[PDB]
Structure formats: C-alpha cells, structure tokens
C-alpha cells in the first residue's frame, strides 16, 4: 500500500497525546496521518496531513530521526514524535467532513492491545475505539523511556 506519514504530538508533561477521530471506516481515534503524494518527502507529507487534520503546523518541530514506524499488512506508517506542544493549543481541522473531533488522551490510560473474548469462548478481539492508535502505544512508551526516562 502507499506509505502513510503523520505525528504523535505530546504535551509538555509528556503524559498526553493528541488523537483525532474520523468518520465511517475511520470512526475511532487515531494519530493524525495520511497517504504520501507522488514525489512528496516523508516530512512534508507528515506536516501536510497533520495540518489538514489538526490545523497545527509541525514543520518547525519535526526531528528527522525521531519517529515510530510500523508495517501493518504490508503498508508502512511512520509517525514523527513531536513533544512539548501546549495543551491549550487550538486545534481545528481544515475539513470537518473528515475529522469529527480532536482530543488529548492520557498515554498511561490508553490501551496497548485489544481485549480478547475468552470470557465468551469466542475467537477474536472485542471492538475498541482506539484500534488505529493501539499498535503505536507500546513502542511509544518504550521510545519515551529510552529518550527521557
Ligand atoms: C481526506 C483524507 O485525508 N482522508 C479521508 C479520511 C481520513 N483519512 C486519514 O488520513 C485518517 C487515517 C486514520 C485515522 C484518521 C484519519 O482519524 C482516525 O484515524 C484518510 C484520508
């Protein structure tokens, strides 16, 4: 699939992250990100997608080496880590046809896996509104421990 780029924005305490809520197939909460355009550099795609989805421009804050990248079902998603953004920042998407809401979440309260349904002897995972964010949570926590401690 086409690579996606975006950001993990943290506040100044490093204990909250900014998530966005879309519609329909992207009806849950996830980090701001989207698909790279032809010939567009990863940092420019991350900034574009984040500004489209949040109205906040990360361009002056991106650090080249500071990101988490995952390959899920053979599609690569790279989120640049952007700490220290104040919680009173006014975030407003460009297109509310794509973004329902924008909120800060406590990192420690976010799930890092979905729950099974072993209580019901049924296979699979229970729905979770953080499903898009979840794969990045443990790597983020590990990354923050290594970088800040
Ligand atoms: C116009 C536009 O940019 N698109 C349309 C709908 C929104 N998209 C996202 O980039 C997107 C991905 C994952 C998400 C998310 C949003 O919000 C919660 O998790 C896909 C592309």
UniProtKB/Swiss-Prot annotation:
This is m7GpppN-mRNA hydrolase. It is found in: Cytoplasm, P-body; Nucleus. It comes from Homo sapiens (Human). Changing residue 52 to Q: Loss of decapping activity. Expressed in brain and testis. Not detected in heart (at protein level). Found in a mRNA decay complex with LSM1, LSM3, LSM4, EXOSC2, EXOSC4, EXOSC10, PARN, XRN1, CNOT6, UPF1, UPF2 and UPF3B. Forms a complex with DCP1A, EDC3, DDX6 and EDC4/HEDLS, within this complex directly interacts with EDC4/HEDLS. Interacts with DPC1B. Interacts (via N-terminus and C-terminus) with TRIM21 (via N-terminus and C-terminus). Associates with polysomes. Interacts with LIMD1, WTIP and AJUBA. Interacts with DDX17 in an RNA-dependent manner. Interacts with ZC3HAV1. Interacts with APOBEC3G in an RNA-dependent manner. Interacts with ZFP36L1 (via N-terminus). Interacts with NBDY. Mn(2+) binds at residues 49, 53. Phosphorylated at ser-249 in a MTOR-dependent manner. Residues 1-131 form the Nudix hydrolase domain. Belongs to the Nudix hydrolase family. DCP2 subfamily. A motif (Nudix box) lies at residues 34-55. Decapping metalloenzyme that catalyzes the cleavage of the cap structure on mRNAs. Removes the 7-methyl guanine cap structure from mRNA molecules, yielding a 5'-phosphorylated mRNA fragment and 7m-GDP. Necessary for the degradation of mRNAs, both in normal mRNA turnover and in nonsense-mediated mRNA decay. Plays a role in replication-dependent histone mRNA degradation. Has higher activity towards mRNAs that lack a poly(A) tail. Has no activity towards a cap structure lacking an RNA moiety.
